[PDB]
Design an enzyme around this catalytic site. Structure first.
Site, PDB file in Angstrom:
ATOM      1  N   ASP A  15      -0.492   0.489  13.950  1.00 38.98           N
ATOM      2  CA  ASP A  15      -0.591   1.832  14.349  1.00 38.98           C
ATOM      3  C   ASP A  15      -0.409   2.113  15.718  1.00 38.98           C
ATOM      4  O   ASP A  15       0.355   2.406  16.734  1.00 38.98           O
ATOM      5  CB  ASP A  15      -1.703   3.342  14.222  1.00 38.98           C
ATOM      6  CG  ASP A  15      -3.136   2.632  14.250  1.00 38.98           C
ATOM      7  OD1 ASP A  15      -3.343   1.910  15.281  1.00 38.98           O
ATOM      8  OD2 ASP A  15      -3.946   2.856  13.544  1.00 38.98           O
ATOM      9  N   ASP A  71      -8.745  -4.568  12.643  1.00 39.12           N
ATOM     10  CA  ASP A  71      -8.662  -3.375  12.460  1.00 39.12           C
ATOM     11  C   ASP A  71      -7.934  -2.697  11.101  1.00 39.12           C
ATOM     12  O   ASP A  71      -6.768  -2.802  11.618  1.00 39.12           O
ATOM     13  CB  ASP A  71      -8.211  -2.591  13.454  1.00 39.12           C
ATOM     14  CG  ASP A  71      -7.727  -0.958  13.170  1.00 39.12           C
ATOM     15  OD1 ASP A  71      -8.192  -0.110  12.254  1.00 39.12           O
ATOM     16  OD2 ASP A  71      -6.283  -0.065  14.265  1.00 39.12           O
ATOM     17  N   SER A  82      -7.412  -1.040   7.383  1.00 45.51           N
ATOM     18  CA  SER A  82      -7.052   0.123   6.439  1.00 45.51           C
ATOM     19  C   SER A  82      -8.459   0.643   6.110  1.00 45.51           C
ATOM     20  O   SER A  82      -8.189   1.359   5.742  1.00 45.51           O
ATOM     21  CB  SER A  82      -5.554  -0.318   5.690  1.00 45.51           C
ATOM     22  OG  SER A  82      -6.172  -1.397   4.427  1.00 45.51           O
ATOM     23  N   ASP A  83      -9.019  -0.143   6.062  1.00 38.55           N
ATOM     24  CA  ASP A  83     -10.592   0.024   5.265  1.00 38.55           C
ATOM     25  C   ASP A  83     -11.179  -0.565   5.550  1.00 38.55           C
ATOM     26  O   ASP A  83     -11.074  -2.273   6.533  1.00 38.55           O
ATOM     27  CB  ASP A  83     -10.400   0.220   3.719  1.00 38.55           C
ATOM     28  CG  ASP A  83     -10.288   1.428   3.444  1.00 38.55           C
ATOM     29  OD1 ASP A  83      -8.934   1.947   2.559  1.00 38.55           O
ATOM     30  OD2 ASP A  83     -11.355   2.627   3.390  1.00 38.55           O
ATOM     31  N   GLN A  96       0.924  -0.601   0.148  1.00 43.67           N
ATOM     32  CA  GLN A  96       0.032   0.067  -0.001  1.00 43.67           C
ATOM     33  C   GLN A  96       1.019   1.049  -0.604  1.00 43.67           C
ATOM     34  O   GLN A  96       2.169   0.985   0.192  1.00 43.67           O
ATOM     35  CB  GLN A  96      -1.153   0.247   1.156  1.00 43.67           C
ATOM     36  CG  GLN A  96       0.018  -0.073   2.805  1.00 43.67           C
ATOM     37  CD  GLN A  96      -0.882  -0.657   3.588  1.00 43.67           C
ATOM     38  OE1 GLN A  96      -2.246  -0.502   3.927  1.00 43.67           O
ATOM     39  NE2 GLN A  96      -0.440  -1.128   4.576  1.00 43.67           N
ATOM     40  N   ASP A 151      -0.218  -8.256  11.378  1.00 39.08           N
ATOM     41  CA  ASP A 151      -0.368  -7.371  10.374  1.00 39.08           C
ATOM     42  C   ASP A 151       0.248  -7.992   8.896  1.00 39.08           C
ATOM     43  O   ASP A 151       1.715  -8.402   9.387  1.00 39.08           O
ATOM     44  CB  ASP A 151       0.394  -6.131  10.565  1.00 39.08           C
ATOM     45  CG  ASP A 151      -0.473  -4.767  10.135  1.00 39.08           C
ATOM     46  OD1 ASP A 151      -0.516  -5.068   8.676  1.00 39.08           O
ATOM     47  OD2 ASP A 151      -1.098  -3.565  10.387  1.00 39.08           O
ATOM     48  N   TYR A 188     -12.969  11.853  10.273  1.00 39.82           N
ATOM     49  CA  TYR A 188     -13.225  10.408   8.948  1.00 39.82           C
ATOM     50  C   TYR A 188     -14.545  11.155   8.658  1.00 39.82           C
ATOM     51  O   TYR A 188     -15.157  12.570   9.118  1.00 39.82           O
ATOM     52  CB  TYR A 188     -14.087   9.321  10.183  1.00 39.82           C
ATOM     53  CG  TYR A 188     -12.842   8.502  10.180  1.00 39.82           C
ATOM     54  CD1 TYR A 188     -11.340   8.362  10.395  1.00 39.82           C
ATOM     55  CD2 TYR A 188     -13.544   7.455  10.119  1.00 39.82           C
ATOM     56  CE1 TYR A 188     -10.347   7.766  10.762  1.00 39.82           C
ATOM     57  CE2 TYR A 188     -12.210   5.998  10.312  1.00 39.82           C
ATOM     58  CZ  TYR A 188     -10.651   6.627  10.920  1.00 39.82           C
ATOM     59  OH  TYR A 188      -9.714   4.977  11.173  1.00 39.82           O
ATOM     60  N   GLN A 231      -9.915   4.198  18.656  1.00 37.96           N
ATOM     61  CA  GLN A 231      -9.161   2.807  19.434  1.00 37.96           C
ATOM     62  C   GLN A 231     -10.026   2.760  21.110  1.00 37.96           C
ATOM     63  O   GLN A 231     -10.030   1.760  20.963  1.00 37.96           O
ATOM     64  CB  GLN A 231      -7.421   3.258  20.004  1.00 37.96           C
ATOM     65  CG  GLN A 231      -6.948   4.050  18.505  1.00 37.96           C
ATOM     66  CD  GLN A 231      -6.780   3.932  17.801  1.00 37.96           C
ATOM     67  OE1 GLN A 231      -6.401   2.906  16.628  1.00 37.96           O
ATOM     68  NE2 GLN A 231      -7.108   4.894  16.404  1.00 37.96           N
TER      69      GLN A 231
END
Lengths: 289, 291
Positions: B98, B167, B169-170, B43, B118, B233, B74
């Site tokens: 993150d 969680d 990234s989309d 990405q 991840d 957002y 979060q």
């Protein structure tokens, strides 16, 4: 037509003071109307995805797609905190939306509007028909003029007063908050309720704290509630909801209707949302305690 | 060109744009300085210092977090799930590069191990440099990290995790939130396990939320949709699916809580009252999701 706020097919609303460092942009299908009234710049455009948009002095007032959240919450939070509201006033409700919500309540005998600018009413009738249809309701009465002088002529008159007007945000507004709430207090009946547009708790918690303090100097019952609005910067705005009656709790609905008629009448508000809208994130709640 | 440049940043403003996922609207943020831009194997990774929201991480042109407001997402995605389990000891986050969700997970005494899975080492590395108040979690003794794809991880660890938080990234998104993804999660969970997954904003994707709720109900006896507000957002909010394998728990009211004093010490958004309020939906949404 052209407008300074619209470049390369996108409307942008920016304010270094109101929303420092962020903006909201909306894709424009077509500009429908632009005029300078006696009071302000009046812009209507058809957006590609949120219906028609009313913009006053370069700030979005409503879009047809999401206007119902604000109109319903500012109106029914207050109306359902009065035991039997018969005379109701909205100040600054030129687009007709708050009036549309008021006349949903059968007890209401008179739904008054006080707005300064006939041009807003005129353009809302043409371009916001699902809001301004309220002007055809028999209970609606419109006064064109200064809201402050109307309130003096109508002492001890309104069971509910709704201020559908941007919260002024300078040092001048800060010092005059209490004076404005005292003006409203004089026009209310003995258990009268107000709801006023406040600020977004994400960006202006210090202003909300100031508003809460000024309200508590005038009213024995003071609460802060909020609603979500996808086209407003930060995505939400709050309201002060206050009552002259020390005995009412505005954070739990004094009155409600059945879930079935809530589903027929409301798209956002309901008796559960009423309570939830005063439940604030921890850092906000602690600061406003 | 000696200055860093990015297609999402024009005339000093970052624009959050998607003609597919939020057509016709774009939140924008004023940029102070672009800090980092790389393309990983998976990405586009962009970090800029905003003027008013601190550092901002952007993945494939979609905002992920800002330092100023990241705590809402979060806290809500983690604590809604963790406080729906009677005693969560092993917790997994999929895609939490993150470190923010890990930071929330380790606040719970009962948690012994907080795993992260991840695919993209790049996000972890960049987060440690530019999101210190989130990636500080990587140095917590409870935290274990696995670099790899979450499917092979979940298949290897059946009946293992009390809570799994997704969680990505989309919100998927690569919309692999079919019933089969939830079946895979179901098997990796212990017998009263809980999941929270990023869902959609109810203002623009109510039909996807309804479909997501149906798919979850095919797998889990206990399914709820909550939301939180996020000023950077699209639409200013996003929702979560919170599900439990235990038919005898109500995820919409917190099974566990801490004292109000500890809440004010540890949390900036979540608390036991907000937990309940986050499942109270506007009438048009509630009616559609009960259909």
């Amino acid at each position: 037509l052209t407008h300074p706020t619209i470049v390369d097919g996108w409307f942008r609303e920016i304010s270094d003071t109101m929303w420092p460092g962020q903006a909201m942009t909306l894709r424009v299908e077509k500009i429908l109307h632009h005029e300078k009234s006696k009071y302000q710049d009046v812009l209507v455009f058809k957006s590609t995805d949120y219906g028609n948009v009313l913009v006053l002095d370069n700030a979005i007032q409503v879009t047809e797609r999401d206007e119902f959240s604000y109109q319903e919450m500012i109106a029914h939070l207050a109306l359902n905190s009065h035991p039997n509201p018969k005379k109701v006033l909205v100040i600054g409700g030129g687009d007709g939306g708050v009036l549309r919500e008021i006349v949903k309540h059968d007890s209401v005998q008179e739904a008054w509007l006080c707005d300064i600018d006939e041009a807003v009413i005129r353009v809302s009738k043409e371009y916001l028909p699902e809001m301004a249809k309220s002007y055809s309701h028999p209970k609606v009465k419109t006064h064109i003029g200064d809201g402050f002088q109307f309130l003096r002529d109508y002492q001890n008159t309104f069971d509910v007063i709704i201020t559908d007007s941007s919260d002024p945000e300078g040092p001048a507004a800060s010092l005059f908050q209490q004076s404005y709430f005292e003006l409203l207090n004089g026009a209310l009946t003995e258990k009268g309720v107000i709801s006023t547009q406040a600020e977004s708790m994400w960006i202006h918690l210090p202003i909300i704290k100031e508003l809460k303090k000024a309200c508590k100097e005038v009213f024995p019952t003071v609460g802060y509630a909020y609603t979500t609005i996808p086209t407003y910067p930060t995505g939400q705005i709050g309201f002060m909801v206050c009552s002259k009656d020390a005995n009412v709790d505005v954070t739990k609905p004094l009155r409600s209707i059945s879930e079935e008629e809530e589903e027929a009448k409301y798209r956002y508000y309901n008796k559960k949302v009423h309570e939830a809208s005063f439940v604030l994130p921890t850092w906000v709640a602690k600061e406003l305690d």
